Design an enzyme around this catalytic site. Structure first.
Site, PDB file in Angstrom:
ATOM      1  N   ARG A   1      92.229  38.282  24.638  1.00 41.53           N
ATOM      2  CA  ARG A   1      92.808  37.843  23.202  1.00 41.53           C
ATOM      3  C   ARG A   1      94.233  37.183  23.639  1.00 41.53           C
ATOM      4  O   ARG A   1      94.523  37.195  24.806  1.00 41.53           O
ATOM      5  CB  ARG A   1      93.232  39.165  22.591  1.00 41.53           C
ATOM      6  CG  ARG A   1      94.100  40.057  23.322  1.00 41.53           C
ATOM      7  CD  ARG A   1      94.677  41.092  22.376  1.00 41.53           C
ATOM      8  NE  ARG A   1      95.150  42.305  22.952  1.00 41.53           N
ATOM      9  CZ  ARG A   1      96.600  42.146  23.455  1.00 41.53           C
ATOM     10  NH1 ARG A   1      97.378  41.114  23.235  1.00 41.53           N
ATOM     11  NH2 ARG A   1      96.915  43.256  23.905  1.00 41.53           N
TER      12      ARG A   1
ATOM     13  N   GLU B   1      94.774  58.117  44.965  1.00 38.31           N
ATOM     14  CA  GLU B   1      95.383  56.795  44.473  1.00 38.31           C
ATOM     15  C   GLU B   1      96.469  56.432  45.332  1.00 38.31           C
ATOM     16  O   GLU B   1      97.456  57.471  46.033  1.00 38.31           O
ATOM     17  CB  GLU B   1      95.656  57.123  43.059  1.00 38.31           C
ATOM     18  CG  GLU B   1      96.504  55.947  42.448  1.00 38.31           C
ATOM     19  CD  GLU B   1      96.491  56.172  40.972  1.00 38.31           C
ATOM     20  OE1 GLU B   1      95.595  56.095  40.283  1.00 38.31           O
ATOM     21  OE2 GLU B   1      97.772  56.147  40.483  1.00 38.31           O
ATOM     22  N   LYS B   2      96.549  55.293  45.728  1.00 36.33           N
ATOM     23  CA  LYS B   2      97.651  54.666  46.560  1.00 36.33           C
ATOM     24  C   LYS B   2      98.930  54.854  45.762  1.00 36.33           C
ATOM     25  O   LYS B   2      99.138  54.443  44.912  1.00 36.33           O
ATOM     26  CB  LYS B   2      97.534  53.224  46.792  1.00 36.33           C
ATOM     27  CG  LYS B   2      98.338  52.826  47.963  1.00 36.33           C
ATOM     28  CD  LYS B   2      97.912  51.480  48.844  1.00 36.33           C
ATOM     29  CE  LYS B   2      98.851  50.733  49.734  1.00 36.33           C
ATOM     30  NZ  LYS B   2      98.850  51.678  50.709  1.00 36.33           N
TER      31      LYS B   2
END
Length: 440
Positions: free
Chosen positions: A287, A196-197
């Site tokens: 929503r 993950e960066k």
């Protein structure tokens, strides 16, 4: 226009919807638990039904109860607000099957965007990436691992399938050795790791949209909600300050395209991490959101009223060219909790005084003599300010907070008073780590 709307929610958002309904000449049905008999919006509603006992699982989340109330009252539409049943696809689905209108999107779309994988794929088709990483597990093959890391860009993080067993790699010469070692540290039992960066200045920036389900969608600009505690938002602002204008216009266009592609109907929000010029998608809230008012202030568009118009079968009304972001808005969430220990503070409000004057809006169900019950969340009001620029919004929020009295319970007002005088926050652009580091 919708004949009768059942407000399947409570608190400030119930009152918010009620107000929108009255403006449009829509009859209202309020539902409430036994613990919520004192709620301000009940006596403003045309009809009120007690749907169950205090616990949310035995009242507001009971689909049979809400649907029975809709049928007894002859409601033609249901507005779920935020939380509770708003993103419950089973509920939207029942509403569809019963012939009611849901003020929101289809069950199918709620499911699409409520699952990480299908949501990611939908955004990918629209041209929007997620936080860069391995997709998904990082392979053991060395050159494939190095190629993925290089594209992601260093530094990178190596996570276990399970903030634990987590390791930063600064340079590619250390990648293989470090991944190797993170796998061995499991046995969690599972030797799966992904990449993950590392983001240096991650900001929470989100894009507000309205979409009619008939081929039209618009954005209402963006918001920054980076001041967070335990992932609960504290203060929000619109527009997000200091954003690369080209990157912004591109992500606006992609969000609008996404709406059209997935067949979105109603109000929705695309949440991003913004990292020095680039937007990375996290999730779509299918929503309305708590912080919608700041976008209302800077655009002059009433988001809840448009939801209701759309739900009644109308196309937008507003073209994108009619949407101009002017000035700057701030919102402080007033929570009934300790301002330092964040322990909920249920109790009786002996005296409530709201701030007023130019550029000061207050969305709250508080009143003098009202008891905040222990059963539900801590949100009791929203103070929203609007100014010609961020500095004026801040100055008006300082004035507003000085006038707010919620006597009898503890609130987070003092924290807000500190934040709007905080040097880093006043300069602007603090990231999602700011508040927790500052608090300790």
């Amino acid at each position: 226009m919708l004949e009768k709307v059942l407000i399947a929610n409570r608190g400030e958002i119930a009152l918010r919807i009620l107000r929108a309904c009255k403006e449009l000449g829509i009859k209202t049905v309020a539902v409430h638990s036994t613990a919520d008999r004192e709620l301000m919006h009940l006596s403003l509603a045309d009809e009120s039904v007690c749907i169950g006992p205090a616990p949310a699982t035995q009242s507001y989340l009971q689909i049979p109860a809400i649907i029975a109330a809709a049928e007894v009252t002859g409601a033609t539409a249901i507005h779920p607000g935020y939380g509770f049943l708003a993103e419950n696809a089973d509920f939207a689905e029942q509403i569809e099957r019963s012939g009611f209108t849901f003020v929101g999107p289809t069950a199918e779309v709620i499911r699409l965007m409520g699952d990480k994988v299908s949501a990611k794929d939908a955004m990918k088709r629209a041209g929007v990436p997620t936080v860069p990483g391995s997709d998904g597990p990082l392979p053991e093959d060395e050159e494939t691992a190095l190629a993925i890391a290089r594209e992601v860009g260093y530094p990178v993080i190596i996570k276990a399938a399970g903030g634990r067993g987590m390791r930063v790699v600064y340079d590619e010469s250390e990648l293989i050795k470090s991944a190797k070692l993170t796998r061995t540290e499991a046995g969690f039992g599972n030797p799966m790791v992904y990449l993950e960066k590392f983001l240096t200045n991650p900001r929470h920036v989100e894009v507000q949209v309205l979409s009619d389900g008939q081929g039209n969608a618009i954005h209402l600009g963006d918001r920054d909600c980076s001041l967070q505690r335990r992932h609960q938002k504290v203060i929000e602002e619109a527009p997000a300050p200091g954003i690369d204008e080209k990157a912004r216009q591109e992500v606006f266009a992609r969000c609008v395209q996404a709406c059209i592609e997935i067949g979105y109907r109603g109000a929705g929000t695309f949440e991003f991490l913004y990292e020095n010029g680039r937007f990375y998608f996290i999730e779509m809230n299918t929503r309305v959101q708590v912080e919608h008012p700041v976008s209302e202030m800077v655009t002059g568009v009433d988001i809840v009223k448009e939801m209701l118009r759309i739900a009644s079968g109308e196309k937008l009304s507003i073209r994108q060219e009619d949407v101009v972001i002017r000035g700057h808005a701030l919102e402080c969430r007033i929570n009934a909790e300790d301002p330092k220990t964040f322990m909920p503070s249920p109790g009786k409000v002996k005296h409530f005084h709201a701030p007023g004057g130019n550029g000061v809006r207050v969305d709250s169900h508080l009143y003098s003599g009202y008891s905040v019950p222990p059963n539900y969340d801590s949100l009791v009001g929203k103070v929203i300010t609007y100014g010609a620029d961020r500095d004026e919004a801040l100055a008006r929020m300082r004035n507003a907070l000085d006038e707010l009295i919620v006597d009898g319970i503890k609130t987070n007002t003092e924290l807000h008073k500190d934040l709007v005088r905080d040097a880093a926050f006043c300069k602007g652009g603090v990231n999602i780590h700011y508040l927790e580091k500052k608090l300790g």
